[PDB]
Amino acid sequence: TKANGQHAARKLVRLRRKNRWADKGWKKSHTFVAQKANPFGGSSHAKGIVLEKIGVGAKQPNSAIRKCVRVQLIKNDKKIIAFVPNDGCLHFIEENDEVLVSGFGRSGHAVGDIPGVRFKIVKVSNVGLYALYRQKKEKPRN
Amino acid sequence: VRMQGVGHGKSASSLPFCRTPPSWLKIASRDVIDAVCKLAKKGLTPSRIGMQLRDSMGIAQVKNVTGRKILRILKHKGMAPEIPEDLYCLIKRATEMRKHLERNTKDRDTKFRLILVESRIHRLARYYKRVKQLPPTWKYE
Amino acid sequence: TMMSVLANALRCIASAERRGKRQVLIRPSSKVVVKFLQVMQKHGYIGEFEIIDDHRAGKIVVNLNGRLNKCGAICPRFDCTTPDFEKWVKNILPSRQFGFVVLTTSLGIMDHEEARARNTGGKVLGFFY
RNA sequence: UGUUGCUGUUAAAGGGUUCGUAGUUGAAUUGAGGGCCUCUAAGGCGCAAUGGUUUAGUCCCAUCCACUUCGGAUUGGUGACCCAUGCCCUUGUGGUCCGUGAACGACAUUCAGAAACAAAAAACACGGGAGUGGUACCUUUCCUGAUUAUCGCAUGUCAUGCAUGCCAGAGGGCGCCCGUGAUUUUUUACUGUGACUAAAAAAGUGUGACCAAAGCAGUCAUUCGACUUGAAUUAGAAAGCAUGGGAUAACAAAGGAGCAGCCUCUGGGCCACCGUUUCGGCUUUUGUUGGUUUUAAAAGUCCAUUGGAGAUUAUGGGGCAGUGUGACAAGCGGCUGUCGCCUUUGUGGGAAAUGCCUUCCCUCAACUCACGGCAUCCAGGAAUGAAGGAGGGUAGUUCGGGGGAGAACGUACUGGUGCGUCAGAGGUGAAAUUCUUAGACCGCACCAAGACGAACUACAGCGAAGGCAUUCUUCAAGGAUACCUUCCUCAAUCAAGAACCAAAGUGUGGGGAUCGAAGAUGAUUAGAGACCAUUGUAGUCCACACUGCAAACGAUGACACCCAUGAAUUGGGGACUCAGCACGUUAUCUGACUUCUUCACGCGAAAGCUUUGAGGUUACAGUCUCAGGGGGGAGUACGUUCGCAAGAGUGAAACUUAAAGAAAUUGACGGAAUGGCACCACAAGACGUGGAGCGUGCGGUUUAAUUUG
RNA sequence: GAAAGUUCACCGAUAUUUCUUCAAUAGAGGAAGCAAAAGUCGUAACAAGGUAGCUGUAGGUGAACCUGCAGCUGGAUCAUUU
């Protein structure tokens, strides 16, 4: 339980300081190993250079093929996978094009039917990829 | 609760509800006093002085028929012991255990008991050097 | 042992009241326990009580009229103040209408209602409905 | 993340146990006062009076007599009691007043609180200062005397002295500063109030920037300005500041003979006072400074008795002596074991007075009772209490598979020896491994060696836990109970630290019967050191060292309080020969273990839990401590401490996944159980098919298609 | 009066070298974790799962595991000489 004494204070304090290390919602904030691990440095986005297009399978209950992109990160020289999140826009990504990369949804667990991938490609060459998809802009090769 | 180890007992001695002396005790303060000091010269502790008195002379309590109890009497006449009753007894029991254990080092029980008795004596010691009744350099050994 | 006299008394009263019993025994007595009872007997929640003398420590005995619903104890005796009457009165009581918190002051032992009136806060003591 | 307000029996989570320091928490006492008057203010389990035919009653009585469950009868009967006012006792409200516990003098003082005293008071009283108080402040009693300032008189005049004096005494009353005195002054948290504290920001008051976020502005007459123009106010952690309050707490001291002032009138005697080193310091007045010295107060000290107290009896206790009283056994006596000593001798009783006094019996325990001398010795009884809080004592040869030591006892297992018999024996589902004419198995007798102590042995006991079972002896303990003994808060729980700890393991020595990991052999099987069978090493046992790893479980931490139903058990207590004993029954109590398979309330998701809690918890707070934060990854890795080693303590992350888990229910299944039912099941048994030669269907292959279900 | 310069003391940049501490980092090979598949070998657990199960410990085995020893019931038993 707990201590109700007048001078009990210090025991209470030290108890909390111990038991917050059993919380993962404390660690995720205060500890900088988490920051380091994250490929953006904990920044909102980052840019990368497209390496290779990689076809990626899917898990057992929903059989599909998914289009993914092996990208390298300018900032930290790490490699990462990301998903193309529109229909038939694999075309609009080509090798050695700069590209932006974002997280998607829950960022501690991988998204369903794509293992290991929490990362979706928002922008190709700073153009909105959505804009290309539902036609407004056209991709520069300029 | 028992201080060390298990035990709950209610074995105890009460008090009289009459704190004034009986009608069949016509003895004065002085006679009581004299009796105490007389007995004490045999080396009897206060615990057995009270027993001798109550049983023979019908004394209700020493405190009821004199203005003071057994140690206060002794102190005032300079017969009082310098080692309190409760302390002395434990030390006797202690030493006797240590005899038995000197011979028998396979004895599990009396070993554990000696550990108890030790720390109990220490508690007493500590007490009586806060509330001065022993020298402040006293130690069990 | 018991580290609060009040706690020993008012867990006999509460239990007894939930069984509807019309008298209760109380093992110790203090100057404090008296005052607490006195309050509630004025406001109409207790018939009478006796203090009996063993010439060591007394044994209180109380007559319940069944008009109580709880008698609690606020154990650490936390500090309540002129603004903070409000706080306590909301949080530990089911009402502001008939909730009675009892407090200690230099002045004596009294209800929160009378405490406010004389404009002195103090350390809390116990409570009843 | 649960301080307010979390959970830990089974879902993530009580440490194997105990001791124990820091730390946290800790029982009760000191005690918060009263009266008289008014008030329909209430109650009355107080009460004089007087009221009431049954206009209301019950006990007694009357008449019946009714064997026993009818009644009525009147004035019944200060009876009982019922509906009434004061007399009441409390208490409500109302006023003021108290030396506000008891105590002291009471009109001429001290007057209804004052001198003294009690109590309170250092915010005080004890002495004193002109450099104190805008030129030394105010005042009333008692006498002296009255300036009635006819700005005059006196002091003073070389004066810018064109400047003061204009109340003796009495107690004083404030203000100011300093000196002295306290038996042990005194603080703090908390609270109320008040000080002291930048703006911006926030809360907020006013205001129509057209509204609005905003701003601190503006608004009005009506002119050669007015509003005294507005621009309020509050909060703002601790910590520091001042001053009330004095309940609850904390700090510190005391720890009880480890102590402790009686006050006071007056008189005398002596006496420096600081200080003690080769001469130092020193209080006014005498005109003053310089010198010495005296007288005198003060203080100290000695004696003296003047008045008054005391919180513990000084005409007293303690100890010696004389006389008489009561009395034991020998020496003596009764004239029947016991009585007395020149009686009586137990105690109230008896007598006699107006419960008491006196007389009379005439106060026993080897000294007890009564009286007297005077001789002694010499402070001592003034303390809160003794917690169903802790420690200690004593007792029942108390209580128990509690612990250590020493000595015997019991059969069995195994082996050996002797006396006999003769062919198989071991062992299993069936076998085989295994043992036998060199006589096994078997029977009896005896001996050796090692382990163990059956049945009795339990919804029993003891131990801190782990654990503990033949008998006798022996050593030191532990719990329970009983007590009008002792101590007086010494306690509760726990980081740190210390001790104990099942089995298997490790070191060294002894032992080695039985069983037995490893190993060996035979089966079983598709495969089988398997499970099974025959063997067999370590080990199993003991001593001395380590290890501390268990489902070490009640998966339930420790201490404390409250909490109901019934029947038992285990200990203690209560109502000649180990012997004023032991058992049992009835009833009661304290201490242990548990059952209601009629456990009360309540709690819980349910299973369940119930004075023996998981209950008294959203109406959430008795106290302390340890552990847990979805499931895996992991008790892994790294570091580090312990260990001979095996291992023990401490203890992550990367990455991955959306469930894991708890309980109950309904279905289904079981080489689970029980009761039943079927020639599509089987028993007994009659007839076939199943491999030939044919017909038909299907499969395969074939082919233009060999249609297809 | 006073400059260049001299000697000594003090403050001490920086370089060099060593040590300490923190951060990040390559690596043959070995060993785990996780995630896939329509691979392979067995049948251990759940029914008495066909050798009741599990915990601690030691040994053995190709695997799941098996075996001895002491416990627990979360057993297949709340229970059979008053």
Side-chain angles (χ1 to χ4, degrees), chain A residues 129-137:
Chain A
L129 183 55
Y130 186 63
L132 305 181
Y133 178 56
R134 185 69 62 175
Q135 190 178 1
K136 290 172 176 291
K137 300 177 68 178

PDB file of all heavy atoms in Angstrom, chain A residues 129-137:
ATOM      1  N   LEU A 129       2.773  13.786 -53.750  1.00  0.00           N
ATOM      2  CA  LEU A 129       2.620  12.572 -54.522  1.00  0.00           C
ATOM      3  C   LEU A 129       1.157  12.361 -54.782  1.00  0.00           C
ATOM      4  O   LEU A 129       0.783  11.948 -55.875  1.00  0.00           O
ATOM      5  CB  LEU A 129       3.188  11.326 -53.806  1.00  0.00           C
ATOM      6  CG  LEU A 129       3.133   9.995 -54.596  1.00  0.00           C
ATOM      7  CD1 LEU A 129       3.807  10.088 -55.977  1.00  0.00           C
ATOM      8  CD2 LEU A 129       3.736   8.847 -53.764  1.00  0.00           C
ATOM      9  N   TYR A 130       0.295  12.663 -53.777  1.00  0.00           N
ATOM     10  CA  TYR A 130      -1.142  12.809 -53.917  1.00  0.00           C
ATOM     11  C   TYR A 130      -1.555  13.694 -55.087  1.00  0.00           C
ATOM     12  O   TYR A 130      -2.502  13.366 -55.797  1.00  0.00           O
ATOM     13  CB  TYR A 130      -1.776  13.355 -52.603  1.00  0.00           C
ATOM     14  CG  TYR A 130      -3.287  13.380 -52.672  1.00  0.00           C
ATOM     15  CD1 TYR A 130      -4.015  12.186 -52.813  1.00  0.00           C
ATOM     16  CD2 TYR A 130      -3.976  14.605 -52.689  1.00  0.00           C
ATOM     17  CE1 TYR A 130      -5.405  12.216 -52.983  1.00  0.00           C
ATOM     18  CE2 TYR A 130      -5.366  14.639 -52.859  1.00  0.00           C
ATOM     19  CZ  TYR A 130      -6.083  13.443 -53.008  1.00  0.00           C
ATOM     20  OH  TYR A 130      -7.484  13.478 -53.191  1.00  0.00           O
ATOM     21  N   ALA A 131      -0.842  14.826 -55.322  1.00  0.00           N
ATOM     22  CA  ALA A 131      -1.100  15.734 -56.421  1.00  0.00           C
ATOM     23  C   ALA A 131      -0.900  15.080 -57.768  1.00  0.00           C
ATOM     24  O   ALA A 131      -1.648  15.347 -58.702  1.00  0.00           O
ATOM     25  CB  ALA A 131      -0.253  17.021 -56.374  1.00  0.00           C
ATOM     26  N   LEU A 132       0.147  14.233 -57.911  1.00  0.00           N
ATOM     27  CA  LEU A 132       0.387  13.448 -59.104  1.00  0.00           C
ATOM     28  C   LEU A 132      -0.686  12.412 -59.353  1.00  0.00           C
ATOM     29  O   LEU A 132      -1.216  12.335 -60.460  1.00  0.00           O
ATOM     30  CB  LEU A 132       1.760  12.734 -59.078  1.00  0.00           C
ATOM     31  CG  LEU A 132       2.959  13.680 -58.835  1.00  0.00           C
ATOM     32  CD1 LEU A 132       4.288  12.906 -58.852  1.00  0.00           C
ATOM     33  CD2 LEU A 132       2.998  14.843 -59.841  1.00  0.00           C
ATOM     34  N   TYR A 133      -1.013  11.597 -58.314  1.00  0.00           N
ATOM     35  CA  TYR A 133      -2.060  10.592 -58.269  1.00  0.00           C
ATOM     36  C   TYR A 133      -3.372  11.100 -58.816  1.00  0.00           C
ATOM     37  O   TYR A 133      -3.855  10.621 -59.841  1.00  0.00           O
ATOM     38  CB  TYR A 133      -2.245  10.055 -56.815  1.00  0.00           C
ATOM     39  CG  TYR A 133      -3.353   9.035 -56.670  1.00  0.00           C
ATOM     40  CD1 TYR A 133      -3.376   7.867 -57.450  1.00  0.00           C
ATOM     41  CD2 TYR A 133      -4.416   9.277 -55.780  1.00  0.00           C
ATOM     42  CE1 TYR A 133      -4.441   6.966 -57.350  1.00  0.00           C
ATOM     43  CE2 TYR A 133      -5.483   8.377 -55.679  1.00  0.00           C
ATOM     44  CZ  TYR A 133      -5.497   7.219 -56.466  1.00  0.00           C
ATOM     45  OH  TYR A 133      -6.581   6.317 -56.380  1.00  0.00           O
ATOM     46  N   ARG A 134      -3.955  12.103 -58.123  1.00  0.00           N
ATOM     47  CA  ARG A 134      -5.190  12.730 -58.499  1.00  0.00           C
ATOM     48  C   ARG A 134      -4.760  14.002 -59.157  1.00  0.00           C
ATOM     49  O   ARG A 134      -4.424  14.965 -58.472  1.00  0.00           O
ATOM     50  CB  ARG A 134      -6.055  13.043 -57.252  1.00  0.00           C
ATOM     51  CG  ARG A 134      -7.456  13.606 -57.559  1.00  0.00           C
ATOM     52  CD  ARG A 134      -8.422  12.596 -58.197  1.00  0.00           C
ATOM     53  NE  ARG A 134      -8.628  11.464 -57.236  1.00  0.00           N
ATOM     54  CZ  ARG A 134      -9.512  10.445 -57.464  1.00  0.00           C
ATOM     55  NH1 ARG A 134     -10.265  10.407 -58.600  1.00  0.00           N
ATOM     56  NH2 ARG A 134      -9.639   9.456 -56.532  1.00  0.00           N
ATOM     57  N   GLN A 135      -4.770  14.015 -60.516  1.00  0.00           N
ATOM     58  CA  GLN A 135      -3.930  14.873 -61.326  1.00  0.00           C
ATOM     59  C   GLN A 135      -4.187  16.335 -61.069  1.00  0.00           C
ATOM     60  O   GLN A 135      -5.333  16.779 -61.021  1.00  0.00           O
ATOM     61  CB  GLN A 135      -4.073  14.582 -62.838  1.00  0.00           C
ATOM     62  CG  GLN A 135      -3.030  15.295 -63.717  1.00  0.00           C
ATOM     63  CD  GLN A 135      -3.223  14.898 -65.185  1.00  0.00           C
ATOM     64  OE1 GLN A 135      -4.129  14.129 -65.527  1.00  0.00           O
ATOM     65  NE2 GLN A 135      -2.335  15.449 -66.068  1.00  0.00           N
ATOM     66  N   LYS A 136      -3.092  17.065 -60.765  1.00  0.00           N
ATOM     67  CA  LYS A 136      -3.057  18.497 -60.699  1.00  0.00           C
ATOM     68  C   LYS A 136      -1.735  18.873 -61.289  1.00  0.00           C
ATOM     69  O   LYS A 136      -1.667  19.584 -62.291  1.00  0.00           O
ATOM     70  CB  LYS A 136      -3.089  19.010 -59.237  1.00  0.00           C
ATOM     71  CG  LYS A 136      -4.435  18.786 -58.532  1.00  0.00           C
ATOM     72  CD  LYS A 136      -4.371  19.112 -57.035  1.00  0.00           C
ATOM     73  CE  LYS A 136      -5.725  18.996 -56.322  1.00  0.00           C
ATOM     74  NZ  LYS A 136      -6.655  20.064 -56.760  1.00  0.00           N
ATOM     75  N   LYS A 137      -0.644  18.401 -60.644  1.00  0.00           N
ATOM     76  CA  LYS A 137       0.713  18.624 -61.061  1.00  0.00           C
ATOM     77  C   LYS A 137       1.167  17.427 -61.837  1.00  0.00           C
ATOM     78  O   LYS A 137       0.537  16.370 -61.806  1.00  0.00           O
ATOM     79  CB  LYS A 137       1.663  18.821 -59.859  1.00  0.00           C
ATOM     80  CG  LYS A 137       1.269  20.032 -58.998  1.00  0.00           C
ATOM     81  CD  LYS A 137       2.139  20.225 -57.746  1.00  0.00           C
ATOM     82  CE  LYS A 137       3.587  20.640 -58.040  1.00  0.00           C
ATOM     83  NZ  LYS A 137       4.338  20.838 -56.778  1.00  0.00           N
TER      84      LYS A 137
END
